[PDB]
Design an enzyme around this catalytic site. Structure first.
Site, PDB file in Angstrom:
ATOM      1  N   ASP A   1       7.325 -29.498  20.121  1.00  0.00           N
ATOM      2  CA  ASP A   1       7.782 -28.187  19.663  1.00  0.00           C
ATOM      3  C   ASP A   1       6.830 -27.133  20.224  1.00  0.00           C
ATOM      4  O   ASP A   1       5.965 -26.618  19.511  1.00  0.00           O
ATOM      5  CB  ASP A   1       7.841 -28.182  18.106  1.00  0.00           C
ATOM      6  CG  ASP A   1       8.409 -26.890  17.527  1.00  0.00           C
ATOM      7  OD1 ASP A   1       8.811 -26.014  18.319  1.00  0.00           O
ATOM      8  OD2 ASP A   1       8.454 -26.752  16.279  1.00  0.00           O
TER       9      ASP A   1
ATOM     10  N   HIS B   1      16.198 -22.047  17.973  1.00  0.00           N
ATOM     11  CA  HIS B   1      14.957 -22.781  18.174  1.00  0.00           C
ATOM     12  C   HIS B   1      15.215 -23.955  19.111  1.00  0.00           C
ATOM     13  O   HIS B   1      16.163 -24.712  18.898  1.00  0.00           O
ATOM     14  CB  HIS B   1      14.410 -23.269  16.825  1.00  0.00           C
ATOM     15  CG  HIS B   1      13.043 -23.870  16.911  1.00  0.00           C
ATOM     16  ND1 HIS B   1      12.084 -23.401  17.786  1.00  0.00           N
ATOM     17  CD2 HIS B   1      12.470 -24.897  16.237  1.00  0.00           C
ATOM     18  CE1 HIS B   1      10.979 -24.111  17.647  1.00  0.00           C
ATOM     19  NE2 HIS B   1      11.187 -25.031  16.719  1.00  0.00           N
TER      20      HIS B   1
ATOM     21  N   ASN C   1       4.088 -20.988  24.204  1.00  0.00           N
ATOM     22  CA  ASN C   1       5.304 -20.248  23.871  1.00  0.00           C
ATOM     23  C   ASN C   1       5.130 -18.787  24.301  1.00  0.00           C
ATOM     24  O   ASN C   1       4.895 -17.891  23.486  1.00  0.00           O
ATOM     25  CB  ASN C   1       5.590 -20.385  22.375  1.00  0.00           C
ATOM     26  CG  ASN C   1       6.848 -19.665  21.958  1.00  0.00           C
ATOM     27  OD1 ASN C   1       7.736 -19.413  22.778  1.00  0.00           O
ATOM     28  ND2 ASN C   1       6.932 -19.316  20.672  1.00  0.00           N
TER      29      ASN C   1
ATOM     30  N   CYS D   1      13.825 -20.299  26.452  1.00  0.00           N
ATOM     31  CA  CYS D   1      14.866 -21.162  25.890  1.00  0.00           C
ATOM     32  C   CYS D   1      14.574 -22.638  26.126  1.00  0.00           C
ATOM     33  O   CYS D   1      13.533 -23.145  25.711  1.00  0.00           O
ATOM     34  CB  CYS D   1      16.244 -20.800  26.469  1.00  0.00           C
ATOM     35  SG  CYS D   1      16.598 -19.010  26.505  1.00  0.00           S
TER      36      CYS D   1
END
Ligand SMILES: [Br-]
Length: 340
Positions: free
Chosen positions: A276, A259, A13, A18
């Site tokens: 995730d 998120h 991350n 996005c």
């Protein structure tokens, strides 16, 4: 330990990218695309310019790393290094930039045409005059379908709306050339659907009322098994257009921020994981599907695979499927990185 828990590894991350990490995993688990990506000849390419080489590196690391996989060389390669580049595009545009570069580098090689074989369908867009005998037919190719969701309960109603007839009358009559302004009806028809079906759900639209982009969090339903034969002009008895849910790309929150997460059953067997960013975990089939219907979390994009193409599209990918030359370049690059 997401490699231990699921067999799969996540993506770092490292920026306001996005939908990008969600999209990258979706392409990674398009096994036939991944294998073809490994066969592009990039030996003479530049290590900081080549979108072909940089997607090979991401895919290789996703296949081999036990640690979360970075993307900086990927985003430098296609030139989106600020959030402004990601706000100004949607996920289908990033998918086109990735696959167009990948398709062009496959020209002249043994995997040429892999991108249209997997993602390209054929449709017909027509305008038909009622009072005069004129028709204009435009055959078109598509790589993805944008489906409206406002006022629709499910995928089936969206496809019904998609193929419906639009009337051209009053102040929006059709310019029929030598016939002048004519009342007419306009529609589209599907002739083929591709083996891998990318459907974007139009939750992010421009508000006409304001000057602000909005997100529609309404409830919208999609099935694990999607039959689409009845939206084709001619169906094949030996190949019905039955589709299997492969991937659910999800967002929660406001249009600005929020998120981004993708759910996948990589093998198409209904065994789902939640991806995730750096964390991959097993999840229930209900968390992947029903819990993203809406009503916070909801789906903005779906990937389906044609049932007759599922074994081919999701064909097994060994380390032997990565050419030994590509492996040596990437491991040399990582040895240069390891001295850093
Ligand atoms: Br990186």
């Amino acid at each position: 330990g997401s490699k231990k828990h699921t067999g799969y590894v996540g993506l770092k991350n490292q920026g306001a990218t996005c939908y990008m990490n969600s999209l990258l995993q979706t392409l990674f688990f398009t096994n036939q695309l991944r294998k073809a990506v490994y066969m592009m000849p990039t030996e003479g390419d530049d290590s900081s310019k080549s979108v072909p080489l940089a997607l090979q590196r991401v895919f290789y690391e996703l296949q081999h790393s036990d640690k979360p996989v970075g993307t900086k060389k990927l985003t430098k390669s296609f030139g989106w290094e600020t959030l402004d580049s990601f706000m100004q595009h949607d996920v289908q545009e990033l998918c086109r930039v990735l696959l167009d570069n990948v398709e062009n580098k496959m020209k002249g090689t043994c995997v040429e045409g892999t991108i249209p074989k997997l993602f390209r369908g054929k449709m017909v867009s027509y305008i038909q005059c009622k009072e005069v005998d004129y028709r204009s037919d435009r055959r078109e190719d598509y790589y993805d379908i944008q489906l409206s969701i406002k006022g629709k309960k499910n995928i089936f109603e969206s496809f019904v709306d998609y193929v419906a007839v639009e009337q051209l009358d009053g102040d929006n009559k059709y310019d029929a050339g030598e016939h002048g302004l004519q009342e007419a009806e306009k529609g589209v028809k599907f002739l083929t659907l591709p083996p891998v079906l990318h459907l974007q759900l139009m939750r992010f639209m421009y508000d006409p009322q304001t000057d602000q982009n909005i997100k529609i969090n309404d409830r919208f339903e999609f099935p694990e098994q999607l039959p689409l034969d009845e939206f084709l002009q001619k169906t094949d008895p030996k190949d019905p257009a039955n589709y299997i849910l492969h991937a659910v790309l999800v967002h929660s929150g406001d249009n600005h921020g929020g998120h981004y997460v993708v759910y996948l059953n990589p093998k198409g067997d209904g065994k789902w994981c939640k991806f995730d960013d750096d964390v991959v975990s097993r999840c229930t089939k209900e968390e992947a599907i029903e819990h993203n219907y809406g009503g916070c979390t909801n789906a903005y994009m779906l990937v389906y695979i044609r049932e007759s193409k599922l074994s081919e599209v999701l064909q097994a990918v060994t380390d032997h499927d990565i050419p030994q030359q590509l492996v040596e370049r990437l491991q040399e690059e990582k040895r240069i990185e390891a001295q850093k």
